[PDB]
Each structure stands twice: as structure tokens, then as C-alpha cells.
Amino acid sequence: MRERLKRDLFQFNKTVEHGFPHQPSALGYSPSLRILAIGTRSGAIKLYGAPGVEFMGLHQENNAVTQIHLLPGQCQLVTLLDDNSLHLWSLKVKGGASELQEDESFTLRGPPGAAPSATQITVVLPHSSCELLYLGTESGNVFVVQLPAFRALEDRTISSDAVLQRLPEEARHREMVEALQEHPRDPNQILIGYSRGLVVIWDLQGSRVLYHFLSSQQLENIWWQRDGRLLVSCHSDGSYCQWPVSSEAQQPEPLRSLVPYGPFPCKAITRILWLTTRQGLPFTIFQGGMPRASYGDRHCISVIHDGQQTAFDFTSRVIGFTVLTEADPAATFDDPYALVVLAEEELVVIDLQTAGWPPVQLPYLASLHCSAITCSHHVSNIPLKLWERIIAAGSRQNAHFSTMEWPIDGGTSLTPAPPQRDLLLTGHEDGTVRFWDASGVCLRLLYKLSTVRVFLTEWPPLRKVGSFDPYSDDPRLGIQKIFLCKYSGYLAVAGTAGQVLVLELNDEAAEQAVEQVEADLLQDQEGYRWKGHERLAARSGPVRFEPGFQPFVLVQCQPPAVVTSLALHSEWRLVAFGTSHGFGLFDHQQRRQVFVKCTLHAEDSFTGFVRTLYFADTYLKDSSRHCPSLWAGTNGGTIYAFSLRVPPAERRMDEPVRAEQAKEIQLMHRAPVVGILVLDGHSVPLPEPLEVAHDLSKSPDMQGSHQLLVVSEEQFKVFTLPKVSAKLKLKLTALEGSRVRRVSVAHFGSRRAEDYGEHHLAVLTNLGDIQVVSLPLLKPQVRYSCIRREDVSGIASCVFTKYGQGFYLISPSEFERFSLSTKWLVEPRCLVDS
């Protein structure tokens, strides 16, 4: 096209990522800013606050983030990678909005030639003065660093030999600093806990020991009470003690030492927290302690309060956890209200105020891979009537969740509310279809559909929480294709075992039976037998369904192969499906099969393989009478066309729908057809089903001669209807050497002109590039390098939107949104201050 028009329509920019970060490795939190922080093995530091308030950074060394410590009060955080290096980050306001950038780095190094295992940092203690970083090492020495200008203060070094010199008379030889904290009410005193059991309270200015005790078990971690008068240790045998802190010197014995899961041999407690409440009932949170014999493989975090105990069992390893408290540094009681747990595959938030401790919904950081993602489907511009009903159905199934508002509400999002409501439907392996809010910066779950309903299959206090499921139950339930009609509410989903469910949204619950209808694809062919999965056993009789998308008809394909294509026309109430053998049309209004076409030549050739199905109300035989039509594309470059006879509503349930094959066009290059489209007289694609009923202005131009657009992996072609005479072609693979993976129509609004937009093709190549093919001239406009050509998973997982956006999986747990339109750029823009 023209250069002025090209710049006003196309601009490639990878906006923001949606979902859970892959392989988390650290967790941090700022109670003063209410901002969460997550670190990964790839070096990514990700901050999270209120919905729409998020940041992201990358360390120059791609290494694993081990610890994240946000400074109190200040908007600066310190991280520590597995290379024993510190990094100071800050959130500087540039242009009215905050942004995350790295300030300075520092690697703790000792004398030249010393062992690197002696300078390994274990505990990082930011002082309350926001000026020093006390670093506990494996050698037992505590090092002090200045912020900024990281300079190790050798004069303030608290070595191991210095602490052992200040012990009265009991120092029976011997460090690995396991704990390093500050006195909550005295910034002058710090605590140093050693692995063998030595825990001292060190006076900084006095350079002496004020309090010490030698525990009987190997120390793991330490928690100091809010008033600084009680110490709660945890050990390597699965026990936790209580120690009184006063000014009587001597060596006070443990107050209450016990193994909470004994008397059997348990594993260590990794971390323990002792928090106080105004009701006199303190909380006791500890991670681990399971019996090594029967529960050594469980990742659990227990919470003890008011005679109630619950060990929350997660399906993945616990990377880190924190307890949000309503208390500030100048408060009496801690008063917990939330348990934020970061597992290796999910995030779990537990409400601590409501009885039973119910989970808290996640407005972001959702585990999109709790079930293995198989396919996706995006629908743009959802009607407000249907949009509120989907959320209403999702609220009825989430009644067991907590009523507490999202506690991590830091920052102020400067982005307005999304003017257009978008939906991203995700197919999973267990047979679930999740409805996501792909309208704004946060990808929040709205409603979950479970298709498994139509098929046929207290000490220690363990309570399985979370959503991730690492077990692959049945691969036959894996959703393969999804079609959602945003107008009538009809939903069509396809599975791996040849099952096709046509559902309808229902406000109230219903108890109905799913009529099962068989579609024998191999009706005009015998000899070859099926080897593999058997058809899914359907539930006979009525089945209770919760409000939402209730299935009313099941179409079982024979043979039960993988459904490779799906198309639903809610106006004509027809649904078309295709597998590796053939395809067929189904009338879900009468629950009767219309026709079934076999497309073959045990195993032999690799032809057939229905790839695309497209409904169209265009001309097929004459140039005056337009009739409904169903088009089909195969792997062998064959395009089938069927004439449909859709009766009126007065004759809808009376006379059955008829069909007859009218055209069979064979391509000259014999490449698999990836897309079929029909343009009207003004070279505009045919509108979606029921779109003319909800918008008469989008009526297709019937005066001009329609055009048929056939897109293959090698060429684009345009034919003249109804004669199907070749007119335009673009040999993409012959010019650029790339093959077409998938193509989708997109409307590109203009930036120079407010209300002007042209329809064009969004093409994803096998090389990972994203091109734009102009209509109807089939001219290449722009090519943007996006996905790597070796990312076979990310390329297949790609999906385009109707208005020039797209999504693709950079990891099995998170998407990345890209925008090739000048009218769309969904990115986080936020402000955070103290």
C-alpha cells in the first residue's frame, strides 16, 4: 500500500506478558508499598501491585534469583542471584509514570585466594536505617555494605571468631549463618543464629554479646517476636522451640520444645513465623516437618491458631511464602490476614480472617498451565449482555472462595479501563475450557467449563490447595478446537477422541440429558481398521449441570480420531467438524446429522486431513441467487464446496436440511489449505454469523461479483465466483521461501483518520515471522520478526485477534501479547510512591 497509509495502520510491538512466570525462584514483598516480587531462574525480576501496576527487569547475567528484599519505606529493592552478587533496583518516576531499572551491583569477595564457599551469602539483612546490608555467609562472618556505593565495611565486620571471644566461658569449639535479623524495637541489636545451634544477640556499637543460647538441634531459621522478648527457633529434626529474651544473662532453657508431627522421624522446618494478634491468639506458621517415611515428598506449609491446624499441601515445590500483616513497624499486634504462597507452578493466597481459611481469587498471575494447554481461541468485542452473564456464571462456581478484597493493592494504575471487552478461550488437556479477560493488562479468569461431566470416569491436617495438576489423566479429553458465537451464546468445542460438544449459555442450573449422535466418517470405505484410543463413554440419562455453558448434544466421530477443524454457524444452527479422515455437517437444532464426506485415497498416504472449514452465503452456481455454502480444505490442496438449503423457522423443525456437493477445486501446487475466505462486491470479507442480524450496516455487498480467497501453505489465491476462475495469486514460498502456518482476517484502524479501517490478512510464517497480506490485491505489506523459527511450540500456539493483536506462549505458563495495529497497545503504565 501507500507509505502514509502503511504507517497509519501497522506497527509491531510486543506489549506485555500475561500469566505465571516460568520456573520461579524467589519471593519478596513490601508491606509499606503492598508490592509483590517474583524472581525466576532466567534472571527476571517481576514486581506486582494493584491490577495494572506491574514492572519487570532482567539481570545482565542470566542467572537464578535466590532472594528478594525490598527496603522498608523506600521504593528500592535488593536481590541476590546464585552467583553470590547483590543488585540494587529502584523505581524512578520518568514521564509521570514509574519504571523499574537497575542501579548498582556488587559481588562479595574476600581475600585473594580464599575459598569461594566462605563468601557465599546466605542471609541478607537490610538495616532499618536503609543504609547498610548485613550479609551472613557460610563462614560465619557478617559483612556490612553501604547503599549506595557498595563498599564492604571491613571495620564493621562481625567475624565468627569475634562472637566466640565474647562468650562467657562455654565455647566448646564449634559456622554457616542460618539467621540474621534485627531487634524489632532496638535498631542497635541484631541477631545471629548459627547452624550448629549458637544464637547470639549482638550489640553493634558495643561490639559484645548481650544474649546467647546453644540449642540441642541443628538450627534452620529464627523468628523474633514483635516486642523482642520471645524467640521461636526451628531445627533440622522437625521441632520448634520457644526462648525467652530478657536481661538476666545466664542461659535460659527452651519454653516449649516439641515436634508437631512426631513421634515419627520427620524432616526439617525450613522457616517458621510467630505472629501476634489482638485477640491473644498468636499464629504459628511453619514450612515442612512432614514425616520423612510417609510424607517426605509433600510440599506443605502449616498454620496453627486457636486450636486449629492446617498443613496446606501444594502440588509443586514451595519456592517462597509470606504472611501479610496489617501492622506497621510501630504497631503492637501483627494481626495476620493473608497467606501468600509462591509455588513452583502456581500462586496460592489464603484468607486468614474468615473461618475455614478459604482461598483468594487471583486478579493476575494465573496458572494457565494447571492443565496442559492444547489450543486457544480469541473473540473480540463481546456484547455487554453476554459479558455480564459469563462473569455471573463464574461467580456461582466460585462461592467457596474468600470475600476478602485483593490485599496486594500497591501502586496506582494510570491506564484507563479497557473500552472493548475481549475474550481469550483456552483449551486444556483434562477437557476444560477457561474463559479469560483478555481486555486489559491483567488476564483474570472469568468462568471455567468442564467437559468431563458428559463422560464416565485428620492428623496430620492435610488440605490440598491450589489448581496445578501435574498428572496427565486422559489425553482423549484434550480440547482441540473452540468456537464461541458472541451473539447467540452458542459454544462449540472439539476434543481429541473425536467428540464435539455444542453448548449454550444458561443463567440458571439445569438437569438434562446430552443426546449422543454418531457421525461415521468411514461410511463409503472399509478394510482399514482403527488402532488406538476408544470412543469416550458418554453419560446416559439426565446429568445435573451448574449454571454456565450446558451441553445439549454430543457428536461422536467414527473413527474417534483427532478433530482438526471446527466451524459453527449459529444463525443456520449448523456445526461442521473434520478429522484426519473426513468431515461432516451437523444440524444441532434438530439434533440430526446432515451429511458426512470421506476424504481418503492401517496407513498408506498422508493426504486428506481436513484443515479448514468456512461457512459462506455466496454464489456457487448462478450469478443471481446466493445460497448458503460450506467450504472444506484438505492437506492435498483439495477445496470442496457444498450447497446448503437452510429452511425458514416455520419449516426449520419440519423439513430437514439438505446438502449437495457443488464444487471441487484442486490446487496447482498441492499444498495444504490453511484458510478459506470469501469477499463481497467491495472486497470485504463476509461478516460473522448473526453479525448482520445485530448490525445491518455490515450487510455484504451483493451487487458486485463475490471473490473466493484460498490460502495455502505455499500460495495465496483469489478466484471469481461463481465460475471459480483464477484472478490473483501470490507465490509466497516461491519469493520469500517461507510457508504459511495460519492466517486470520484483521481490521486495522487508522491513526491519522479516527474512523477508517481496512480488512487485511495476518499471516504467521513457519520462520516465526508475522506478515500482513493486503486485500484484495494479495500484496505483502510488512514482515516483523517475532517468534524464533526453532520455537515450534510457540508458533503453533499463536492466535490472532480481529483488530490486529495476538498472543503466543513464551512459556507453558504465560503468554506474550503483541500488537501490529496502530490503534491497540495494551501495556502497563503505573505510578508508585511513598
Q: In Å, how far are 68, 463, 491, 509, 544 from 513, measured between CA atoms?
A: 54, 34, 17, 13, 9
Q: In Å, how far are 14, 16, 179, 736, 755 from 7, measured between CA atoms?
A: 17, 22, 58, 23, 16
Q: What residues contact 817, with CB distance under 8 A and at least 6 apart?
A: 14, 15, 16, 17, 18, 805, 806, 807, 826
Q: In Å, how far are 213, 218, 219, 263, 269 from 241, measured between CA atoms?
A: 12, 12, 10, 16, 12
Q: Residue 540 carries which DSSP code? A: P
Experimental method: X-ray
Resolution of this deposited model, Å: 3.9
* Distance in angstroms (rounded) separating the CA atoms of residues 592 and 65: 58
HEC readout, 330-375:
CCCCCCEEEEEEEECCCEEEEECCCCCCCECCCCCCCCCCCCCEEE
3-state DSSP helix/strand/coil % of the chain, to nearest 5 = 5, 45, 50
* Distance in angstroms (rounded) separating the CA atoms of residues 826 and 625: 44
* Distance in angstroms (rounded) separating the CA atoms of residues 195 and 178: 6
Count the neighbouring beta carbons within 10 Å of the beta carbon of residue 107.
13
The backbone torsions φ and ψ at residue 43, rounded to the nearest 5 degrees and listed phi first, read 95, 5
The Cα diameter of the chain in Å comes to: 108
Alpha helices in 549-696 (DSSP H): 691-694
* Distance in angstroms (rounded) separating the CA atoms of residues 674 and 632: 10
* Distance in angstroms (rounded) separating the CA atoms of residues 578 and 682: 31
Beta bridge partners of 553: 502, 515
Which has the closest alpha carbon to 791: 759, 754, 816, 758? Answer: 816
**Do residues 21 and 344 make contact, with C-beta atoms less than 8 angstroms apart?**
no
Whether the bond between 559 and the residue before it is cis, its omega within 30 degrees of 0, is: yes
Which CATH entry fits the domain spanning 3-373: 2.130.10.10, 1.20.1250.20, 1.10.3720.10, 3.90.1200.10?
Answer: 2.130.10.10
795 sits in which H/E element: helix 792-796
* Distance in angstroms (rounded) separating the CA atoms of residues 117 and 763: 53
* Distance in angstroms (rounded) separating the CA atoms of residues 13 and 807: 12
- Give long-range contacts, CB 8 A cutoff, 24+ apart: 774-779: 774/1, 775/679, 775/683, 775/685, 775/709, 776/679, 776/683, 776/707, 776/709, 776/718, 776/728, 777/728, 778/716, 778/717, 778/718, 778/728, 778/729, 778/730, 779/1, 779/730
Chain centroid to CA 638: 38
For the chain, the distance separating the N- and C-terminal CA atoms, rounded to the nearest angstrom, is 50
**Do residues 123 and 108 make contact, with C-beta atoms less than 8 angstroms apart?**
no
Q: Residue 158 carries which DSSP code? A: B
Beta bridge partners of 425: 377, 435
The backbone torsions φ and ψ at residue 745, rounded to the nearest 5 degrees and listed phi first, read -70, 145
Alpha helices in 629-751 (DSSP H): 691-694, 732-735
Q: Report the alpha-carbon angle 348-349-352, nearest 5.
A: 140
Q: In Å, how far are 312, 483, 530 from 504, measured between CA atoms?
A: 37, 12, 32
Q: How many CA atoms lie within 13 A of 832 on its CB side?
A: 31
